[PDB]
C-alpha cells in the first residue's frame, strides 16, 4: 500500500492554524516517538478523493463536514470508534454533522460560520441591510474608500445572500428538491450582480484581494470566518464582528461548517490517528495551540468552548450560525458547489444572465438524482415488465422516461445479438460482479464520442442486464446496477450534459 506505517501525515487547508497543529504534532512525537507531518496542499478537497481511491494520501484529512459523506460513500474513510466517555466530551450536534448512513465518519473540531467584519474607524455603525450598502458605498467613495469587499470566487461567501429570501440547497433531507433557481435565489444574486454593475464591487475580487483591502483599511467591511481574525489583529485595524445584513427584511443564512478530521480508510495507522485526535488535538491545550495560530471558531470540545463563548466575536459567530443552516453531507454536495460556483462567477462576469446561470446550476446540482430516477425506473420496469406506480414528485423525469422507452425499445431490438454476446463475455451473476461493471463501462462508454445515441445505448445495455438479473433471481442487484450506470454517465459527462440542457435536451433531441 502506498501509505507508510509508523508515522502520521495530516492534510489541512491553508487558511487554518497549521503551524499550531504542527506544535500539537511535536508534543505527540515527544510522548510517543512517532513523527507527525502537517501539509496544506492546494485543492486538497479535490485531491483527497483522487489519491485516496488508489489507497494513497494522508492518514488524517481536515475539512468542513460537507465533503465527508461523499468520501464515506466512496469507501475513503474509516469508521471511528470513540467510546461513550469520549463522545460525551463534544456537542451532540457536532457528532450529527459527521454521521453518514448511521456511522461516525470523522471527529468534529469546530463550528464555523461567516460574519460581517467591519472597520470601526470607518464605519462605527455597520449596516443592518444589504439594501443600504449602495448608498454607503457612494458616501465612502467620496473619501477614497469602499463599503464592502469579499471573495466572489467561492460560493460559500455569496450563499448567505442567495439564501436570505428563500434560496436553499436541499429541503429539510429531500434530495429531489433543490432551491437554487427559485425566486428568492434569483433576487439575491440579482442584488449581487447589481452591486457589481453599479461599481460597488468588482467581479474579480478574491480571497487575497479582499483580505488585503480590509487589512490595509481601504474597505469598510468584509465577509469572512474566524480564521481571518489573526491577520486583522496583526494589521492594527480596529474591527468588529457582527451579524450579517438582512435582505428584503430576512436574515442572511450562512451555510454552517463543522471543521472535522477524517481517517483515511487505507491508513495502516488508524490507532495512532485516533490517539492523536482524541488525546492530543481534542483537549484544551491542543485546541489552544491551533486556536492561537488561527482562530477555530466555536470548538466542538465543551470544556474549551465554555472559555471561547465569552468572546463577543464568538457570540457573533454563533448568532450568524443560528440564522443559517448546517450544511448537508450527502455525496452530491460536491456537485452542488461546483454548479453554484460557476453560476456566481458567470453572473458576476456578465458571461450569463442571472436566470441563465441559476438554471444551469439547478440542472447541475440535480443531475445525479434526476438521472438516477430515470435510469432506475427504466431498468426496473424493463426487468419486471411493469412500471413503477409512484409519482415522480418530475415533469422532466416523466418525459425523459417516455422518450427513453420509445428510443430504447429500438436500440435493444437492433443490438440484441451484440448485447447477448457482451453479457456472456462479462458473466454478471451477483452484486460483486456489478462492482466490476463500472471499470468496463467507463472504458467502453468514455473512449468514444459523446452523443445521446451512445447514452441510450449504455442505458439499453443496462436494461438488458437488468432483465438477465431478474431471470436469475438477483433482482436486488438492479438498483446497484442503475447506480453504477448513473455514476459513469454523470462523472464522465457532466459538463456535456449540462451544456445539452440535461434531460430536457434529451427529450428535445428525440422529439424528433
Ligand atoms: C459494457 C457494454 C457497453 S456500454 C456501452 N455504452 C455505449 N455504447 C456501447 N456500444 C455501442 C454499440 O455497441 C457503441 O460502442 O457505440 C456500449 C456497450 C457495448 C455492448 C455490447 C457490445 C459492444 C459495446
Ligand atoms: O465555496 C464552496 C465551498 O465552501 C465551503 O468551504 C469553506 C470551508 O468550509 C471553510 O473552512 C473556509 O476554508 O473556506 C471555504 C470556502 O472557500 C465548503 O466546506 C466546501 O466544500 C465548498 O467547496
Ligand atoms: Na482552496
Swiss-Prot record:
It comes from the Bacteria. Its main location: periplasm. It is found in: Periplasm. One of its GO terms (molecular function) is carbohydrate transmembrane transporter activity. GO terms for biological process: maltodextrin transmembrane transport; maltose transport. Keywords: Periplasm, Signal, Sugar transport, Transport. The keyword Mitochondrion does not apply. GO terms for cellular component: ATP-binding cassette (ABC) transporter complex, substrate-binding subunit-containing; outer membrane-bounded periplasmic space. InterPro entries: Maltose/Cyclodextrin-bd, SBP, SBP_1_CS. Transmembrane segments: none annotated. The complex is composed of two ATP-binding proteins (MalK), two transmembrane proteins (MalG and MalF) and a solute-binding protein (MalE). Belongs to the bacterial solute-binding protein 1 family. Part of the ABC transporter complex MalEFGK involved in maltose/maltodextrin import. Binds maltose and higher maltodextrins. NCBIfam families: PRK09474.1. This is Maltose/maltodextrin-binding periplasmic protein. It comes from Escherichia coli O157:H7. The lineage of its organism: Bacteria, Pseudomonadati, Pseudomonadota, Gammaproteobacteria, Enterobacterales.
Amino acid at each position: 500500500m502506498k501509505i507508510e506505517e509508523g508515522k502520521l501525515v495530516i492534510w489541512i487547508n491553508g487558511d487554518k492554524g497549521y503551524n499550531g497543529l504542527a506544535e500539537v504534532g511535536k508534543k505527540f512525537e515527544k510522548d510517543t516517538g512517532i513523527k507527525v507531518t502537517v501539509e496544506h496542499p492546494d485543492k486538497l478537497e479535490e485531491k483527497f478523493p483522487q489519491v485516496a481511491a488508489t489507497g494513497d494520501g494522508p492518514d488524517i484529512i481536515f475539512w468542513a463536514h460537507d465533503r465527508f459523506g461523499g468520501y464515506a460513500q466512496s469507501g475513503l474513510l474509516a469508521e471511528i470508534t470513540p467510546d461513550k466517555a469520549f463522545q460525551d466530551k463534544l456537542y451532540p450536534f457536532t457528532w450529527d454533522a459527521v454521521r453518514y448512513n448511521g456511522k461516525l465518519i470523522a471527529y468534529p473540531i469546530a463550528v464555523e460560520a461567516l460574519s460581517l467584519i467591519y472597520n470601526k474607524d470607518l464605519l462605527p455603525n455597520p449596516p443592518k441591510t444589504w439594501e443600504e450598502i449602495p448608498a454607503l458605498d457612494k458616501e465612502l467613495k467620496a473619501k477614497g474608500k469602499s463599503a464592502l469587499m469579499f471573495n466572489l470566487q467561492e460560493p460559500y461567501f455569496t450563499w448567505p445572500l442567495i439564501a436570505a429570501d428563500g434560496g436553499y440547497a436541499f429541503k429539510y433531507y429531500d434530495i429531489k428538491d433543490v432551491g437554487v433557481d427559485n425566486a428568492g435565489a434569483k433576487a439575491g444574486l440579482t442584488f449581487l450582480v447589481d452591486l457589481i454593475k453599479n461599481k460597488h464591487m468588482n467581479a474579480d475580487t478574491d480571497y487575497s484581494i479582499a483580505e488585503a483591502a480590509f487589512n490595509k483599511g481601504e474597505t469598510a467591511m468584509t465577509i469572512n470566518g474566524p480564521w481571518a481574525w489573526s491577520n486583522i489583529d496583526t494589521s492594527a485595524v480596529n474591527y468588529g464582528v457582527t451579524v450579517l445584513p438582512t435582505f428584503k427584511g430576512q436574515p442572511s443564512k450562512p451555510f454552517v461548517g463543522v471543521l472535522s478530521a477524517g481517517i483515511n480508510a487505507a491508513s495502516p495507522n488508524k490507532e495512532l490517528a485516533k490517539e492523536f485526535l482524541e488525546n492530543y488535538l481534542l483537549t484544551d491545550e491542543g485546541l489552544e495551540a491551533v486556536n492561537k495560530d488561527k482562530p477555530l471558531g466555536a470548538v466542538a470540545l465543551k470544556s474549551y468552548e465554555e472559555e471561547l463563548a465569552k468572546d463577543p466575536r464568538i457570540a457573533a459567530t454563533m448568532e450568524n450560525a443560528q440564522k443559517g443552516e448546517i450544511m448537508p453531507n450527502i455525496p452530491q454536495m460536491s456537485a452542488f458547489w461546483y454548479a453554484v460556483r460557476t453560476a456566481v462567477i458567470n453572473a458576476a462576469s456578465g458571461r450569463q444572465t442571472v436566470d441563465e446561470a441559476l438554471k444551469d446550476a439547478q440542472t447541475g446540482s440535480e443531475l445525479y438524482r434526476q438521472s438516477l430516477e430515470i435510469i432506475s425506473r427504466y431498468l426496473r420496469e424493463q426487468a419486471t415488465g411493469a412500471a413503477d406506480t409512484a409519482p415522480m414528485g418530475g415533469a422532466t423525469s416523466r418525459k425523459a422516461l417516455e422518450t427513453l422507452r420509445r428510443v430504447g425499445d429500438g436500440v435493444q431490438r437492433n443490438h440484441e445479438t451484440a448485447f447477448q454476446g457482451m453479457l456472456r463475455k462479462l458473466d454478471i451473476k451477483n452484486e460483486d460482479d456489478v462492482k466490476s461493471l463500472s471499470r468496463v463501462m467507463i472504458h467502453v462508454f468514455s473512449d468514444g464520442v459523446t452523443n445521446w445515441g451512445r447514452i441510450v445505448t449504455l442505458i439499453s445495455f443496462g436494461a438488458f442486464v437488468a432483465k438477465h438479473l431478474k431471470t436469475i433471481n438477483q433482482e436486488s442487484c438492479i438498483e446497484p446496477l442503475a447506480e453504477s450506470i448513473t455514476d459513469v454517465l454523470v462523472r464522465t459527462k457532466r459538463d456535456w450534459l449540462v451544456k445539452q440542457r440535461g434531460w430536457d435536451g434529451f427529450v428535445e433531441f428525440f422529439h424528433v
